[PDB]
């Protein structure tokens with residue numbers, strides 16, 4: 001059985017790398033008991049002296065302990081004594097949206113397709129574990145290296161806060177139905193975000209008006225330079241009827257073909 005509780009004396013806290021919902025997040029080192037020292041992200045919790053806040057903070061770490069996939073951020077462990085910390089693997093290049101925005105004129109198309117392919121393998125793995133992510137968006141993706149992205153936020157995930165309406169499948173908005181097919185819809189939006197270099201979907205459109213546009217058959221437009229076969233795949237993720245959406249295993253196979261076709265120019 002994997003380690004869950006880890007010793008604070010084995011963590012060296014480094015620089016602050018941003019803010020989380022419960023408190024600041026720092027970069028650091030985990031001095032692994034039998035392996036080399038690992039670079040980690042240490043999530044801190046400001047009010048975790050309250051066991052009620054501690055329970056909410058640790059809920060995501062409980063979910064993460066069940067996963068082991070190369071394109072899903074790894075939980076290293078937690079420290080339940082005050083101050084409560086969640087120790088994740090560090091993805092050195094940070095948040096996907098910022099990374100793509102900064103490199104909009106330098107990242108080749110094959111890298112953007114590779115990120116979408118890697119994410120489809122992580123979502124097929126989640127489906128195989130009976131989890132619905134419910135929050136698939138570029139903001140929840142992290143960059144380990146130029147050729148490796150990882151799904152890193154599991155706050156809304158469920159073993160089967162403001163709603164991300166602009167990413168949600170119509171049956172999720174209308175009936176609170178969350179399935180692997182509704183994750184496919186969200187993944188289509190996340191692929192659109194990657195191909196748009198981190199631009200958000202439906203900018204300047206009110207959340208309450210998104211519903212109407214989707215219901216009327218309106219969809220996110222073809223990103224400039226997106227291969228037509230890839231945009232067609234995105235539109236299939238946005239079929240109104242969830243039964244007409246592709247499955248994650250089909251998305252993975254089709255993205256592999258699209259990636260291969262781009263690498264051969």
Ligand SMILES: CNS(=O)(=O)c1ccc(Nc2ncc(C(F)(F)F)c(N[C@@H]3CCC[C@H]3N(C)C)n2)cc1
Nearest residue numbers: 017018019025041088089090091092093094095152
């Ligand atoms: C390059 N920019 S940076 O600010 O230096 C940086 C910014 C993050 C990172 N890696 C990194 N690796 C892992 C995690 C996580 F904790 F596992 F999620 C992480 N989380 C981010 C840090 C606080 C905000 C949160 N995001 C996802 C909202 N971050 C490495 C460097």
